[PDB]
Amino acid sequence: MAHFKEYQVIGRRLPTESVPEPKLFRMRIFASNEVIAKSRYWYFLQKLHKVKKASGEIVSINQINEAHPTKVKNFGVWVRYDSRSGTHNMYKEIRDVSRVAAVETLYQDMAARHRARFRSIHILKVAEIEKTADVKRQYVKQFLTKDLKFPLPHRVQKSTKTFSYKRPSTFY
Amino acid sequence: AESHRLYVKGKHLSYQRSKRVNNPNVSLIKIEGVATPQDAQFYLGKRIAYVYRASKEVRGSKIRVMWGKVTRTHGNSGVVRATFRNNLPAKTFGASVRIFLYPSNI
Amino acid sequence: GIDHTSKQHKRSGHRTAPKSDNVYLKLLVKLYTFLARRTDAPFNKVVLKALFLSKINRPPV
Amino acid sequence: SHRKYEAPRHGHLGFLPRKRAASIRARVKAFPKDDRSKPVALTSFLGY
Amino acid sequence: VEPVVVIDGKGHLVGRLASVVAKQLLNGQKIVVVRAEELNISGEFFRNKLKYHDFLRKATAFNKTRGPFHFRAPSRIFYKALRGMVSHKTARGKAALERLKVFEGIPPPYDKKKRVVVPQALRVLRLKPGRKYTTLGKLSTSVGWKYEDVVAKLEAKRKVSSAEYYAKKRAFTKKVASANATAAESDVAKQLAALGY
Amino acid sequence: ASLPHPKIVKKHTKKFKRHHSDRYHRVAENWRKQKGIDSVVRRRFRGNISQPKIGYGSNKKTKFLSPSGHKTFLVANVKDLETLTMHTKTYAAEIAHNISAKNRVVILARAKALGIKVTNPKGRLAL
RNA sequence: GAACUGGCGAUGCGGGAUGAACCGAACGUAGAGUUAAGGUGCCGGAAUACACGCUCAUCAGACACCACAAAAGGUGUUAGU
RNA sequence: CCCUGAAAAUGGAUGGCGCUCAAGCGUGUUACCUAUACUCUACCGUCAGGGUUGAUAUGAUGCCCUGACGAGUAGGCAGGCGUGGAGGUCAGUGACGAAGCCUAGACCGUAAGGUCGGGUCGAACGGCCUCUAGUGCAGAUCUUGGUGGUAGUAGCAAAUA
RNA sequence: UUUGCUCCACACAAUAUAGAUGGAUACGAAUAAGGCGUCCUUGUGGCGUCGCUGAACCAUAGCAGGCUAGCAACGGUGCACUUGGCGGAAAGGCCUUGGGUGCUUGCUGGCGAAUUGCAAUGUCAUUUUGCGUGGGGAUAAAUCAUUUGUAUACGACUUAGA
């Protein structure tokens, strides 16, 4: 489900005769589609308040597009996840051009490094790092140096045919 | 001219099949120079001839023909499905067939 | 496959003809088959069905 | 179950099969390694 | 597309080359593989030698001459890999296997024919740099192949003769290229360049 | 000629031979249905012989037709043969196996006179 | 040895190499199309697809039922508090 | 994730070959392959609902229209196939060849089976409507008879020649 | 042994094809490096250029390819002849000297084709042979039987015999 979009989901408890106009709670949810986004909304509202989908209503769901989707950003993400033997809190840094793409990278990386499935991940917070010297992971820091430039040694060229006649090279 | 060919070379690969059951009514053909279904779309409906030789002369000739035609593409790599008037004899798995340019839409 | 809610190929369970080989009874059945098809009187249908019944289903009157 | 008493095998399994030789003249399978500095000489002889 | 495709086995990974050759032969293409002793297997030499020893122990208990046979030559190791990728027990599999020849070195007449490569099976393109790999000739020698030295000597002889061929070929192609360039910028050259030639 | 008919479709041209009639001489080819508890034929395992089924029934507009398009009527004599006088494009006469040669000559002459096709005109011909 | 349900027995078919029971789906005779479960290096029909990472094992690992593995350890390497 | 912990007896099993920026592990996005499943069509059968008689059809358990269904042991029922004999009929077949038998020859039926040609043969035998039963075989360590492989095999070597 | 055997030529008949339909078109080595060209105070040298696929290169026009005269030039390409070499891993192929001869679409010239009827592989290849024709060449053995015992159940083995 990593064709990720971000939605704002606003919902509430159902109005009653004694309590009209409830407090209109809102969440930011990364999900593949609106159905999953509303599911995640009710999942988190059930887990933090005494409101289930039966006693409430979704007032609004809107897709939030990245404000500047074409500038490279440094993102700090806070997650809590479940391992095989406990729950843990984690902080990670992702360099990428949008929030949804950072979160996609986050899910792929948590699956790769911790075998943490989507079920097992709560994204606590995704925030742009305003400036350098606040980045704390070296794998992001090393890309922020001055006049960065590196080669890509050992280029492997795709061959459309079964046999080549030339014993190819890896120069680049 | 040293060449007189007016057909495209093809190879009869196998029958349509699952892992353990084949269907001889459909033949899988690899057309030389075709690598994508998009390219193989050109050849749908083209007549196919399998040409083979016999000792006995039948009707003024010792070389016999099995006719068929390309029906649809198969997979992602340019293989096409073909149906023949009589099914190909399965000893021809790996034999050469001729895909003609008629009927022509170009 | 279909999740059948009732028995398939179930015969209606009613006689569609007299079991007897009486040619005269069969001629009566032919008459009232025509009458019950070509008239809208329920009487003809009742008589046609009564002509199918067995001996125990036609007690003497 | 195990033999209950160990003994060496009877006979040598490297001289198999115990068949008749294909010829009455046994083949010479290996000749001495050649020393090219020495004079030319036979490496074997035949006799009765 | 050629009637016979001659594959230089040097630098290829044995299993990927086997899969490619098996599909070629099953689709009715004739393949000659040369320099089987220069094939490559991923993983360290000791690892692949342990694998071959584990192969070596498998034999019919009551008669070893009918058990699995353990061919030591590099060409026969590659042939063994090709079996298992061809259903060799059928008539069609026997025909596909009869479409195949594998050699150590490059014997005649293939020594004067062009050799091709299979880039999807080339180690230099496929293995991550820094990963250990095994050379089939040395593995075969370690598991009992007898003819590594004679093949290396005779391949050196073929390589010197081929180098003389190539020096002559360089002279001729330089002559042809210079004379073609001289005849360039003529009317026919202009028109052919306009047409894309 | 006969009446025009749709193309004849047989739907199963292969004889339904009884299981193991090729195994044992004592088992004849006449179809019998396997009733054994473990029978692979009765259980319809893949790769076994097919069993006769009502689905194989011939199209009712071409059932009983010969490939010429005629139904076969067996005749023993000339009087039997005239029963097809007005039905020559739907019925063909077949002479019964036990008709003598000199009676077959008379039957054939009458059939040729009336236009009735005979399926076996060459039986018991003298030369 | 009991409970509820679904199955096998009484049932073939596609998949799990193989298998009564698992997954999918239940069956007249055919044609065409689309799929299920399962797959797409080769055997073997179908991408030696695309993408982000992790792992090098001188007993690697490789799919549910299912054909096992533990307590306990490692400046191996990778993320993290 | 990898390694140590981690030992069983014939040689051996991610199904096999093999695979190491995988053809392994986690995750995502597509394309593609193919079941007796789904959709559409034809045909078979079954069940259901219907139409069809004032000179119009083999004269109706016929013809026809419409829809939907089809797995199956033990078992139930129905429609049929075949055999010996009986009543009736075809003024049936037949020494110009009945019955039987043989036939990788033909035709009809989903099938039980039916029909035909050819060969052999020599005296009786069928179709249809009904009646009747000592009425259908692959098995029962079935009964009787006949015949194999084993097999030109074991054996025909005590008692002096 | 119905005047045998073998090898080149040749027309005939069969034959049966795991599958021809322009060309299998030759460095080696490395890949965190190389190819090619050029220059020098010959190197693990300088300089330039290329790759990012064979999507190339060669070939490729003519009744399945018929009939012909020249022009610059002595090219291109078959067929037999021939000169010398090289190649043993399975060489059985590669290169080269000279003349003869055919074609040449490099260019400009001259005639024909139809009716296979609107398609039907529309037959052009490659094997293995047997019967003839006309040239060349060569002129044996093995087994049984007998015999030995370095052998041996029988076969087999090992010896001998004009």
All structural domains of chain E: 1-147 (3.90.1180.10), 148-197 (1.20.5.4280)
Token couple for A159: 């061959």
Resolution of this entry, Å: 2.4
**Count of A-E CB contacts under 8 Å:** 30
Q: Cis before residue D17, ω within 30 degrees of 0? A: yes
Report the distance from CA of residue A60 to the C1' of nucleotide I132 in Å, as an integer.
Answer: 103
The domain made up of B1-106 is a member of CATH 3.90.1300.10: no
Question: Which residue from B minimizes the CA distance to E30?
Answer: B94
E117/A167 Cβ within 8 A: yes
Dihedral sign from CA coordinates of A127, A128, A129, A131: negative
The C-alpha of E192 sits at a distance from chain B's nearest C-alpha, in angstroms, of 22
CB A9 within 8 A of CB A29: yes
- The set of chains that have 3 or more CB pairs under 8 A with E is A, B
Tokens for F102, please give them. 């000199």
Number of domains in chain F: 1
Distance CA D16, CA D22 (A): 14
Method: cryo-EM
Residues of B in contact with E28 (CB under 8 A): 11, 93-96
Q: Is residue F1 part of a domain?
A: no
Output the 3-class SS for chain D: CCCCCCCCCCCCHHHCCCCCCCCCCCCCCCCCCCCCCCCCCCCCCCCC
3 state DSSP class of E160:
helix
Distance A89 CA to G80 C1' (A): 8
Q: Which nucleotides of I are covered by protein (CB under 7 A)?
A: 14-34, 36-38, 51-55, 57, 59-62, 64-65, 87-94, 120-125, 150-152, 157-159
For the beta sheet containing A5-13, the strands, ordered from the edge strand earlier in sequence to the opposite edge, are: A25-31, A5-13, A56-63
CA gap C38, F43 in Å, rounded: 52
Domain span at F69:
6-127
- Domain borders along chain B are 1-106
The terminus-to-terminus CA distance of chain B in angstroms comes to 24
Cα-trace Rg, chain B: 14
- Among B11, B29, B93, the strongest candidate for a mutation testing the E interface, having the largest count of E CBs within 10 A, is B93
The continuous run of DSSP H or E covering A78 comes out as: strand A73-82
CA dihedral E120, E125, E126, E131 (to 10 degrees): 160
Distances in Å between the Cα of A151 and the Cα atoms of A139, A168, E172 are 17, 19, 38
> Could you give the C-alpha distances from B94 to B71, E4, F4, in angstroms and in order?
20, 15, 45
CA dihedral (E152, E154, E159, E161) in degrees, to 10, reads 170
The answer to whether residue A150 neighbours chain E at the CB level (below 8 Å) is: no
- The residue behind tokens 């990670």 is A92
